[PDB]
CSV table of C-alpha atoms and ligand atoms in Angstrom, one decimal:
chain,number,residue,atom,x,y,z
A,1,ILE,CA,-0.1,-0.1,0.1
A,2,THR,CA,1.0,3.6,-0.2
A,3,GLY,CA,2.1,5.2,3.4
A,4,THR,CA,4.3,6.6,5.7
A,5,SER,CA,6.8,4.1,7.1
A,6,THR,CA,6.7,3.6,10.7
A,7,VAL,CA,8.3,1.6,13.6
A,8,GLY,CA,5.0,-0.9,15.6
A,9,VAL,CA,6.2,-3.1,18.6
A,10,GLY,CA,4.5,-6.7,19.5
A,11,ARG,CA,5.5,-10.0,20.8
A,12,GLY,CA,6.4,-13.0,18.4
A,13,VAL,CA,5.6,-16.7,19.2
A,14,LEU,CA,7.3,-17.1,22.1
A,15,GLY,CA,6.9,-14.3,23.8
A,16,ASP,CA,9.5,-12.0,22.8
A,17,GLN,CA,9.1,-8.2,22.7
A,18,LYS,CA,10.3,-7.2,19.2
A,19,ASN,CA,10.0,-3.7,17.3
A,20,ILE,CA,8.2,-3.9,13.5
A,21,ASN,CA,8.5,-1.5,10.3
A,22,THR,CA,4.9,-1.1,9.5
A,23,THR,CA,3.2,1.0,7.2
A,24,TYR,CA,0.3,3.8,8.2
A,25,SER,CA,-2.1,4.4,6.0
A,26,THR,CA,-5.6,4.8,7.9
A,27,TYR,CA,-4.5,1.7,9.5
A,28,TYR,CA,-1.0,0.0,10.5
A,29,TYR,CA,0.4,-2.4,8.1
A,30,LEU,CA,3.1,-5.0,8.1
A,31,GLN,CA,4.6,-3.7,5.5
A,32,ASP,CA,8.7,-2.6,6.1
A,33,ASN,CA,10.0,0.1,3.7
A,34,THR,CA,13.3,0.0,4.7
A,35,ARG,CA,14.4,-3.3,3.2
A,36,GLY,CA,14.2,-3.9,-0.7
A,37,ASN,CA,11.3,-3.5,-2.8
A,38,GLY,CA,9.6,-4.1,0.8
A,39,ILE,CA,8.6,-7.0,3.4
A,40,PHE,CA,5.2,-7.7,3.5
A,41,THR,CA,2.9,-9.8,5.9
A,42,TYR,CA,-0.4,-11.5,5.6
A,43,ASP,CA,-3.4,-13.3,7.1
A,44,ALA,CA,-4.2,-16.1,5.7
A,45,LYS,CA,-7.3,-16.4,8.2
A,46,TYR,CA,-7.0,-19.9,8.9
A,47,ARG,CA,-7.8,-20.4,4.8
A,48,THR,CA,-5.5,-22.0,2.3
A,49,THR,CA,-6.0,-18.9,-0.2
A,50,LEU,CA,-3.0,-17.1,-0.8
A,51,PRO,CA,-1.8,-14.7,-0.1
A,52,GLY,CA,-4.8,-13.7,1.8
A,53,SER,CA,-4.9,-9.9,3.3
A,54,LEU,CA,-2.0,-7.6,4.1
A,55,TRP,CA,-2.0,-7.4,7.9
A,56,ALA,CA,-3.6,-4.3,9.1
A,57,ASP,CA,-3.6,-3.2,12.5
A,58,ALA,CA,-5.5,-0.1,14.3
A,59,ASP,CA,-2.8,0.9,16.6
A,60,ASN,CA,0.7,0.1,15.7
A,61,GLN,CA,0.5,-2.6,19.0
A,62,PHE,CA,1.1,-6.7,17.9
A,63,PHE,CA,0.7,-7.9,21.3
A,64,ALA,CA,-2.7,-10.6,20.5
A,65,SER,CA,-1.7,-14.4,20.7
A,66,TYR,CA,-3.2,-14.0,17.0
A,67,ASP,CA,-0.7,-11.6,16.1
A,68,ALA,CA,2.3,-13.3,17.6
A,69,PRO,CA,2.9,-15.5,14.3
A,70,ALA,CA,2.7,-12.3,12.2
A,71,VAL,CA,5.3,-10.4,14.2
A,72,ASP,CA,7.8,-13.1,13.6
A,73,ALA,CA,7.3,-13.9,10.2
A,74,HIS,CA,7.6,-10.3,9.3
A,75,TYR,CA,10.8,-9.7,12.0
A,76,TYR,CA,12.5,-13.3,10.7
A,77,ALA,CA,12.2,-11.8,7.2
A,78,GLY,CA,14.0,-8.6,7.6
A,79,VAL,CA,16.1,-10.6,9.9
A,80,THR,CA,17.0,-13.2,6.9
A,81,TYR,CA,17.3,-10.3,4.1
A,82,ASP,CA,19.9,-8.6,6.7
A,83,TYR,CA,22.0,-11.7,7.0
A,84,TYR,CA,22.2,-12.2,3.3
A,85,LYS,CA,22.5,-7.8,2.5
A,86,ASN,CA,25.7,-7.8,5.0
A,87,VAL,CA,27.1,-11.3,4.7
A,88,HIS,CA,26.9,-12.3,0.9
A,89,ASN,CA,26.2,-8.7,-0.4
A,90,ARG,CA,23.2,-10.2,-1.9
A,91,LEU,CA,20.0,-8.3,-2.1
A,92,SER,CA,16.8,-10.0,-1.2
A,93,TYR,CA,16.5,-13.4,-2.6
A,94,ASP,CA,16.5,-12.4,-6.3
A,95,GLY,CA,19.6,-10.3,-5.6
A,96,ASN,CA,17.8,-7.6,-7.0
A,97,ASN,CA,15.3,-6.4,-3.8
A,98,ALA,CA,12.7,-8.6,-4.4
A,99,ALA,CA,9.6,-7.7,-2.6
A,100,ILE,CA,9.2,-10.8,0.4
A,101,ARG,CA,5.9,-11.8,0.8
A,102,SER,CA,5.1,-14.2,3.8
A,103,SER,CA,1.1,-15.6,4.9
A,104,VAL,CA,0.6,-16.8,8.4
A,105,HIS,CA,-2.3,-18.7,10.1
A,106,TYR,CA,-2.4,-20.7,6.9
A,107,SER,CA,-5.0,-23.3,7.3
A,108,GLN,CA,-5.8,-25.1,11.0
A,109,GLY,CA,-3.6,-27.2,12.4
A,110,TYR,CA,-1.0,-27.0,10.0
A,111,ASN,CA,2.0,-28.7,10.8
A,112,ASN,CA,4.7,-26.9,8.3
A,113,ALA,CA,5.6,-24.0,6.7
A,114,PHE,CA,7.1,-23.6,3.1
A,115,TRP,CA,7.7,-21.3,0.4
A,116,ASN,CA,5.9,-21.9,-2.9
A,117,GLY,CA,7.8,-20.4,-5.5
A,118,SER,CA,6.3,-17.1,-4.9
A,119,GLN,CA,5.9,-16.4,-1.0
A,120,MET,CA,6.3,-17.9,2.4
A,121,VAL,CA,4.0,-19.8,4.3
A,122,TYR,CA,3.5,-20.7,8.0
A,123,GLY,CA,0.8,-23.1,9.0
A,124,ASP,CA,0.2,-22.3,13.0
A,125,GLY,CA,1.3,-25.9,14.3
A,126,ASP,CA,-1.8,-27.9,16.0
A,127,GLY,CA,-0.2,-27.2,19.3
A,128,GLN,CA,1.2,-30.2,19.8
A,129,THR,CA,3.7,-31.3,17.1
A,130,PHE,CA,4.1,-27.7,16.4
A,131,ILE,CA,3.5,-23.9,17.6
A,132,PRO,CA,3.4,-21.4,14.5
A,133,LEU,CA,6.4,-22.2,13.1
A,134,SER,CA,7.0,-18.6,12.0
A,135,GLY,CA,8.2,-19.0,16.1
A,136,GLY,CA,11.6,-20.4,14.3
A,137,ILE,CA,14.1,-17.9,12.7
A,138,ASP,CA,15.9,-21.3,11.2
A,139,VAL,CA,12.5,-22.3,9.6
A,140,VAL,CA,12.1,-18.8,8.7
A,141,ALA,CA,15.2,-18.8,6.5
A,142,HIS,CA,15.5,-22.1,5.5
A,143,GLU,CA,12.5,-21.9,3.4
A,144,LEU,CA,13.2,-18.2,2.5
A,145,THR,CA,16.6,-19.8,1.1
A,146,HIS,CA,14.9,-22.1,-0.8
A,147,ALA,CA,14.1,-18.6,-2.8
A,148,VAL,CA,17.5,-17.9,-3.3
A,149,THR,CA,18.2,-21.4,-5.0
A,150,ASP,CA,15.2,-21.2,-6.8
A,151,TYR,CA,17.2,-17.6,-8.5
A,152,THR,CA,20.6,-19.2,-8.6
A,153,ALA,CA,21.4,-23.2,-9.1
A,154,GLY,CA,17.9,-24.2,-9.7
A,155,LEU,CA,18.1,-27.6,-7.8
A,156,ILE,CA,15.3,-29.9,-9.0
A,157,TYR,CA,13.5,-31.1,-6.0
A,158,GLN,CA,14.4,-35.1,-5.9
A,159,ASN,CA,16.5,-37.3,-5.4
A,160,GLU,CA,20.0,-36.0,-4.8
A,161,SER,CA,19.3,-32.5,-6.0
A,162,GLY,CA,16.7,-32.3,-3.9
A,163,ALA,CA,18.8,-33.3,-0.6
A,164,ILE,CA,21.2,-31.1,-1.6
A,165,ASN,CA,18.6,-28.1,-1.9
A,166,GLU,CA,17.2,-29.3,1.6
A,167,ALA,CA,20.8,-29.2,2.5
A,168,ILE,CA,21.2,-25.3,1.3
A,169,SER,CA,18.4,-24.2,3.6
A,170,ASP,CA,19.0,-26.1,6.2
A,171,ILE,CA,22.9,-24.3,6.3
A,172,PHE,CA,22.1,-20.8,5.5
A,173,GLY,CA,19.0,-21.2,7.9
A,174,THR,CA,21.4,-22.1,10.6
A,175,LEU,CA,24.0,-19.1,9.7
A,176,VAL,CA,21.1,-16.5,9.8
A,177,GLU,CA,20.3,-18.2,13.4
A,178,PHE,CA,23.9,-17.8,14.6
A,179,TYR,CA,24.1,-14.2,13.3
A,180,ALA,CA,21.0,-13.8,14.7
A,181,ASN,CA,22.9,-14.9,18.0
A,182,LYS,CA,19.9,-16.2,19.7
A,183,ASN,CA,20.1,-19.5,21.3
A,184,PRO,CA,22.1,-20.8,17.8
A,185,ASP,CA,22.8,-24.3,17.3
A,186,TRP,CA,22.6,-26.7,14.7
A,187,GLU,CA,19.3,-28.3,14.9
A,188,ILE,CA,16.3,-27.6,12.7
A,189,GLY,CA,12.9,-26.2,14.3
A,190,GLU,CA,13.8,-26.6,18.1
A,191,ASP,CA,12.0,-23.5,18.7
A,192,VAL,CA,8.8,-24.6,17.2
A,193,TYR,CA,9.0,-28.1,17.6
A,194,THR,CA,7.0,-30.4,20.2
A,195,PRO,CA,6.1,-27.9,22.8
A,196,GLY,CA,5.7,-30.4,25.1
A,197,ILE,CA,9.3,-32.2,24.9
A,198,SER,CA,12.4,-30.5,25.6
A,199,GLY,CA,15.7,-30.7,23.6
A,200,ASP,CA,14.4,-32.1,20.8
A,201,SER,CA,14.2,-31.0,16.9
A,202,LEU,CA,13.1,-31.9,13.5
A,203,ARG,CA,16.6,-32.7,12.1
A,204,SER,CA,20.5,-32.5,13.1
A,205,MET,CA,23.1,-31.3,11.0
A,206,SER,CA,25.7,-32.2,14.0
A,207,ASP,CA,24.4,-35.7,14.1
A,208,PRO,CA,21.8,-36.3,11.8
A,209,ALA,CA,21.8,-39.9,13.4
A,210,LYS,CA,20.1,-38.5,16.5
A,211,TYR,CA,16.7,-38.5,14.5
A,212,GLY,CA,17.3,-41.3,11.8
A,213,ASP,CA,18.4,-39.4,9.0
A,214,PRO,CA,22.0,-41.1,7.4
A,215,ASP,CA,25.3,-39.3,8.1
A,216,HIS,CA,27.0,-41.5,5.5
A,217,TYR,CA,26.5,-42.1,1.9
A,218,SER,CA,26.1,-46.0,2.5
A,219,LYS,CA,23.4,-45.0,4.5
A,220,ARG,CA,21.6,-43.2,1.9
A,221,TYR,CA,18.2,-43.6,1.3
A,222,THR,CA,17.3,-45.1,-2.0
A,223,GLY,CA,13.5,-45.4,-2.1
A,224,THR,CA,10.9,-42.9,-4.1
A,225,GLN,CA,9.1,-41.2,-1.1
A,226,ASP,CA,9.7,-37.9,0.3
A,227,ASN,CA,10.7,-37.0,-3.3
A,228,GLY,CA,14.0,-39.5,-3.1
A,229,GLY,CA,14.5,-39.2,0.6
A,230,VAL,CA,15.1,-35.2,0.3
A,231,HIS,CA,14.3,-34.2,3.3
A,232,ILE,CA,16.2,-37.5,4.5
A,233,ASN,CA,19.6,-37.7,2.6
A,234,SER,CA,19.9,-34.0,3.6
A,235,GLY,CA,21.7,-35.6,6.7
A,236,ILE,CA,24.5,-36.5,5.0
A,237,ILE,CA,25.3,-32.9,3.2
A,238,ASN,CA,24.3,-31.4,6.6
A,239,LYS,CA,26.9,-33.4,8.2
A,240,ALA,CA,29.4,-32.4,6.0
A,241,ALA,CA,28.9,-28.8,6.1
A,242,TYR,CA,28.7,-29.1,10.0
A,243,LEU,CA,32.2,-31.3,9.9
A,244,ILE,CA,33.6,-28.4,7.8
A,245,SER,CA,32.6,-25.6,9.8
A,246,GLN,CA,33.1,-27.4,13.2
A,247,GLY,CA,35.3,-30.1,12.9
A,248,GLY,CA,35.3,-33.4,14.1
A,249,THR,CA,36.1,-37.1,13.5
A,250,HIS,CA,33.6,-38.9,11.3
A,251,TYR,CA,33.7,-42.7,10.7
A,252,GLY,CA,37.7,-42.4,11.4
A,253,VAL,CA,37.8,-39.4,9.3
A,254,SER,CA,39.2,-36.4,11.0
A,255,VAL,CA,38.1,-33.2,9.4
A,256,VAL,CA,39.7,-29.7,10.4
A,257,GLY,CA,36.9,-27.3,11.3
A,258,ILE,CA,37.6,-23.7,9.3
A,259,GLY,CA,34.2,-21.8,11.1
A,260,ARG,CA,30.8,-20.7,10.1
A,261,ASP,CA,31.6,-17.6,8.3
A,262,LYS,CA,34.2,-19.4,5.6
A,263,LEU,CA,31.3,-22.2,5.4
A,264,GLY,CA,28.8,-19.7,4.1
A,265,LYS,CA,31.5,-18.0,2.2
A,266,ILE,CA,32.2,-21.4,0.2
A,267,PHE,CA,28.5,-22.7,0.0
A,268,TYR,CA,27.1,-19.3,-1.3
A,269,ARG,CA,30.1,-19.4,-3.6
A,270,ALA,CA,29.1,-22.7,-5.0
A,271,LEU,CA,25.4,-22.4,-4.9
A,272,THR,CA,25.7,-19.2,-7.0
A,273,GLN,CA,28.6,-20.0,-9.3
A,274,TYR,CA,28.8,-24.0,-9.4
A,275,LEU,CA,25.7,-25.9,-8.5
A,276,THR,CA,23.3,-26.3,-11.5
A,277,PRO,CA,19.6,-27.6,-11.1
A,278,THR,CA,20.9,-31.5,-11.6
A,279,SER,CA,23.8,-31.4,-9.5
A,280,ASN,CA,24.7,-34.2,-7.6
A,281,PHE,CA,26.4,-35.1,-4.5
A,282,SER,CA,29.7,-36.1,-6.0
A,283,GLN,CA,29.0,-32.4,-8.3
A,284,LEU,CA,28.3,-30.6,-4.8
A,285,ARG,CA,31.8,-31.6,-3.4
A,286,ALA,CA,33.3,-30.7,-6.5
A,287,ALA,CA,31.6,-27.2,-6.8
A,288,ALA,CA,32.3,-26.7,-2.8
A,289,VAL,CA,36.1,-27.7,-3.6
A,290,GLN,CA,36.4,-25.0,-6.7
A,291,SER,CA,34.8,-22.6,-4.4
A,292,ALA,CA,37.4,-23.1,-1.7
A,293,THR,CA,39.8,-22.7,-4.3
A,294,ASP,CA,38.5,-20.0,-5.5
A,295,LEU,CA,38.3,-18.4,-1.8
A,296,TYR,CA,41.6,-19.3,-0.3
A,297,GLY,CA,44.0,-21.4,-3.3
A,298,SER,CA,44.4,-25.0,-4.3
A,299,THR,CA,46.6,-26.1,-1.5
A,300,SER,CA,44.3,-23.8,1.7
A,301,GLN,CA,43.4,-25.7,5.0
A,302,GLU,CA,40.1,-24.7,3.5
A,303,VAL,CA,40.0,-26.5,0.7
A,304,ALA,CA,41.4,-29.6,2.6
A,305,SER,CA,39.1,-29.2,5.3
A,306,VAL,CA,36.4,-29.4,2.3
A,307,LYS,CA,37.9,-32.5,1.0
A,308,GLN,CA,38.2,-34.5,4.5
A,309,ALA,CA,34.3,-33.7,5.3
A,310,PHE,CA,33.3,-35.1,2.1
A,311,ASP,CA,35.1,-38.0,2.5
A,312,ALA,CA,33.9,-38.6,6.2
A,313,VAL,CA,30.5,-39.1,4.6
A,314,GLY,CA,31.8,-41.3,2.2
A,315,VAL,CA,30.7,-38.7,-1.0
A,316,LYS,CA,33.4,-38.5,-3.7
B,1,CA,CA1,-3.2,-4.4,18.1
B,2,CA,CA1,18.3,-22.7,18.5
B,3,CA,CA1,18.2,-24.2,15.3
B,4,CA,CA1,10.0,-29.6,22.0
B,5,CU,CU1,12.4,-27.1,3.0
């Protein structure tokens, strides 16, 4: 909408108070004009029609329970923008300040959240398996990262290219969680998964096995469900990403970690300059190595760690 930029205040899903960029024209809208061509958050009103209606509020205060998922969807979309801009010099997901639009309250009891090719969509969860999923900054940054993948490598959402796609989203979602520096970790979704149970998550990057996902190529899922295990085989790449950053010994293979910034730089470069829609695991290895080579030289520690990490998970 046309109006003037202002700042509202509210509480997100986990009861935390934050300021949000809004726009005033009769009502206060969840429209942030300070980032790119804008960040826009909508109410799907428990239906599945999208995007629904631009979020409008009478007093610029967002403290109702109904408001909380919108507050976080909006705020975290902004933190993700900031991550990509400040860290990778990328402006929004298309690199040209594309508007970011999010819908919350999608359907009833919907235990998931997703980028749909045009915008972000967040269910409220059923209150047992999940609380409103925009409560999880890694969840938000994960799904927004599929937009970045759509506009760069274009990794097809199936089999190994699909698990790479997933892995990439897990990797930048986590790096965004670390950048926000709020109880960061290498698990995915812990802030909104199973409010009844402490310390679990959807999956783990540091030890995928913890939730049944493979941590070695030999343990790869080979069937046809989950689009050829895209959310399963990502464990293999996630493990590799984790070892490159934090290092470790895995199946008797030892990796010297080089830290999160370099991991980010190496995988951002691999994603935007070397991966393709049908890249497989082996190709990702060649892409991460070449990226590290571009960045630190063929005989650097960075390249050696990349080589060791993929060896440790069995990806030659
Ligand atoms: Ca209000
Ligand atoms: Ca966390
Ligand atoms: Ca996390
Ligand atoms: Ca839990
Ligand atoms: Cu995903």
